[PDB]
């Protein structure tokens, strides 16, 4: 717990900067009475590069709301992102929060930069499905032990509390399996239900996962031919 504390505290300032951007963005949605105050804070400051970034950000936000538009900051924010040796989260979050201000010429080259450095976001996305990968295994196992009821309970449960998620590959798996349960049961809608999502895997060109979901559906259809 100490090492952790130490680690955080060291990087607290950098994290703090993320919070500023977020709150500054919120102010942009509407009220800016304090919106101007952040400038008053970081105008005379204007030392750290990232603190100038914040300043410039608030500037161009405020500016777009007011009648006058100040471009020297717009250019400042521009060159900063253009000249970046290694693209970080901060770089993304900044880029997002001021992309509209930016000239397309920059944006396109910035895009070139950001296209290599998505490596981390991707590997990170996989582990979102470490929860789902587990859920399916359960279902796959429950059907494999012909515990149709158990499997159906899992589904009903995980649709109730994943209800909030609004994730695709989730809603696919639940639908497909809401299918495959109905199909093994012998109800009508289900035979086509499973293929409906299988369309999506083929349509969106996910050959890898399409294969697995398909071959599986065939494999159970096979075993139910015996029925």
């Amino acid at each position: 717990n100490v090492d952790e504390f130490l680690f955080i505290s060291n990087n607290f300032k950098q994290y703090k900067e993320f919070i500023d951007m977020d709150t500054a963005k919120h102010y942009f949605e509407c009220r800016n009475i304090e919106g101007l105050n952040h400038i008053l804070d970081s105008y005379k400051d204007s030392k750290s590069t990232k603190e100038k970034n914040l300043f410039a950000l608030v500037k161009v936000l405020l500016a777009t709301l007011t009648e006058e538009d100040c471009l020297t900051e717009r250019t400042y924010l521009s060159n900063y992102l253009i000249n970046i040796e290694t693209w970080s989260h901060y770089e993304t979050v900044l880029f997002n929060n001021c992309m509209f201000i930016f000239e397309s010429c920059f944006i396109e080259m910035v895009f070139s930069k950001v296209i290599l450095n998505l490596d981390k976001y991707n590997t990170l996305r996989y582990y979102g499905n470490e929860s789902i990968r587990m859920f399916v295994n359960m279902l796959i196992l429950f059907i494999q032990r012909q515990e149709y009821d158990k499997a159906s309970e899992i589904l009903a449960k995980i649709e109730d509390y994943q209800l909030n998620d609004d994730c695709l590959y989730e809603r696919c798996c639940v639908s497909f399996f809401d299918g495959i349960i109905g199909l093994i049961n012998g109800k009508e809608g289900a035979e086509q239900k499973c293929v409906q999502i299988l369309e999506i895997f083929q349509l969106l060109n996910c050959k890898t996962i399409h294969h697995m979901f398909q071959t599986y559906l065939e494999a159970i259809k096979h075993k139910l031919s015996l029925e």
Binding site: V136, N137, I140, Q144, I209, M212, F213, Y216
Partner: peptide, 8 residues
Amino acid sequence: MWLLLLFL
């Protein structure tokens, strides 16, 4: 004791 595991 079926011989499977993981898959998707």
